[PDB]
Design a protein around this ligand. Structure first.
Ligand SMILES: C[S@@+](CC[C@H](N)C(=O)[O-])C[C@H]1O[C@@H](n2cnc3c(N)ncnc32)[C@H](O)[C@@H]1O
Ligand code: SF4
Ligand SMILES: [Cl-]
Ligand SMILES: [Cl-]
Ligand SMILES: [Cl-]
Ligand SMILES: [Cl-]
Ligand SMILES: [Cl-]
Length: 429
């Protein structure tokens, strides 16, 4: 009944309106603040104002509400996954990325079946059970055949609970082919919802098509895939507009198919190899926290993924404010887990370390999925973390003890989970 194009019109009008409201925001701001105190639902425009304007009261109450919501739906739970880069060759040529075709400065590698499977083994040995397959864009038949041989091989040869997919837009037939591979979630980032900056930053290849990428998730849905992931690259254009666009997009999906997006991925634009993107929008840490906050409060039952590597202190603040999924010990280059290739110029950090840090900041690391996507549910996460701890009992004993103790504390925090506590203590000797 509706078409994707409508979104861009809406978010456009909104983006205009908000900007007018930007010069007399006082009154508006006030009412918004009240809406945040009462815990009332908030609208697109008021969200726009909430982002655009930086005042002490507004930001503090916004963050407060964000933490309250994240706690109410997700608790102290943070889901961990590792991205597996299968190939860094591509047809397209965006200004911002390292994988762009005109780069030349990049070691172009595509992984054999044995190599990819070995990468899955290396990621699994770490303790990870969730993988995000990521590739540069090749022709449809190419990539889909490649994955048609690789994904079931991973499922069978390795103990991976979920394979998520970040592959360039496909045809309906292609998505019908992908649904047969039994993938978990299909993630496709719009990168930008402004056609004027989308045209600006995407220079060569099929990605130059705005609409073909915009209703890609629609095709993914109608082809039988129910779990999808939106995303918007921040720093490409005016952050207000992209933030507006994501919420409008999820809204649209919810209205059209009755199911919203499983996850919204929010990556800020990072330093790249031989990037030629000059014009920039500096995404400040504060404003970033504002984006994840507004996203958490606007789409509460929608998971939020932190794809980009962030410093610890900010990372776990973002986890506090809405983020429900995280990339830990991530390798951003194909073939490196075993094993310049990479997409980001990164100082690899160890999974056990960040699990330690997470457990000290009071967070519950998980390796399970099935969050609330089906429609507290702590048990599944509890036991995923239990399995992790048991897997690393010999690698790091002190971490095993610390983890056990933490789990005991959480278990005593909830009286409805007595038998769960007994079971957990049985499992860990
Ligand atoms: C490697 S692409 C894989 C999927 C597919 N090639 C596509 O374009 O949709 C993964 C994501 O990394 C993000 N990315 C690319 N360059 C980036 C950069 N320089 N800084 C931050 N994120 C970037 C893009 O948003 C892209 O969707
Ligand atoms: S942005 Fe994605 S599709 Fe474009 S060159 Fe980079 S990896 Fe390939
Ligand atoms: Cl997921
Ligand atoms: Cl750090
Ligand atoms: Cl990382
Ligand atoms: Cl480790
Ligand atoms: Cl240790």
């Amino acid at each position: 009944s509706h078409m994707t194009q409508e979104i861009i019109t809406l978010v456009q009008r909104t983006y205009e309106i908000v900007n007018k409201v930007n010069r007399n925001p006082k009154e508006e701001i006030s009412q918004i603040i009240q809406k945040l105190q009462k815990g009332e639902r908030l609208s697109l425009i008021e969200a726009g104002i909430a982002f655009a304007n930086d005042t002490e009261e507004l930001d503090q109450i916004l963050f407060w509400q964000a933490r309250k919501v994240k706690e109410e739906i997700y608790g102290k739970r943070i889901v961990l996954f590792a991205p597996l880069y299968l190939s860094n060759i591509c047809i397209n040529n965006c200004s911002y990325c390292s994988f762009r075709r005109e780069n030349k400065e990049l070691s172009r590698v595509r992984l054999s079946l044995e190599e990819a499977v070995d990468e899955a083994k290396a990621i699994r040995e770490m303790g990870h059970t969730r993988i995000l397959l990521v590739m540069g864009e090749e022709p449809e038949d190419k990539t889909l055949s490649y994955l048609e041989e690789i994904i079931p091989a991973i499922y069978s040869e390795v103990d991976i609970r979920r394979i998520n997919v970040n592959i360039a837009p496909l045809t309906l037939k292609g998505y019908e082919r992908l649904k047969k591979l039994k993938i978990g979630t299909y993630q496709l980032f719009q990168e930008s919802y402004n056609p004027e900056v989308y045209r600006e930053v995407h220079l060569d290849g099929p990605k130059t098509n705005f609409l073909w990428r915009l209703n890609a998730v629609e095709r993914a849905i109608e082809a039988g895939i129910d779990d999808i992931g939106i995303g918007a690259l921040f720093g490409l254009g005016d952050p207000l507009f992209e933030l507006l666009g994501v919420i409008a997009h999820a809204d649209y999906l919810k209205k059209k198919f009755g199911i919203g997006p499983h996850t919204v991925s929010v990556p800020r634009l990072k330093p790249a190899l031989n990037s030629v993107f000059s014009n920039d929008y500096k995404i400040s840490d504060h404003k970033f926290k504002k984006i994840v906050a507004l996203l958490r409060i606007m789409l509460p039952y929608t998971g939020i993924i932190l794809s980009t590597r962030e410093p610890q202190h900010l990372r776990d603040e973002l986890v506090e404010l809405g983020v429900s999924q995280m990339s830990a010990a991530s390798r951003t280059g194909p073939g490196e887990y075993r094993g310049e290739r990479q997409q980001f110029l990164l100082d690899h950090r160890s999974l056990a370390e960040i699990v330690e840090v997470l457990i000290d900041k009071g967070f519950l690391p998980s390796f399970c999925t099935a969050c609330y996507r089906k429609r507290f549910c702590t048990p599944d996460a509890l036991f995923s973390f239990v399995e992790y701890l048991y897997e690393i009992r010999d690698k790091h004993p002190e971490l095993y003890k610390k983890g056990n103790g933490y789990l005991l504390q959480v278990v005593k925090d909830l009286p409805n989970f007595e038998n769960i506590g007994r079971a957990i203590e049985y499992i860990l000797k």
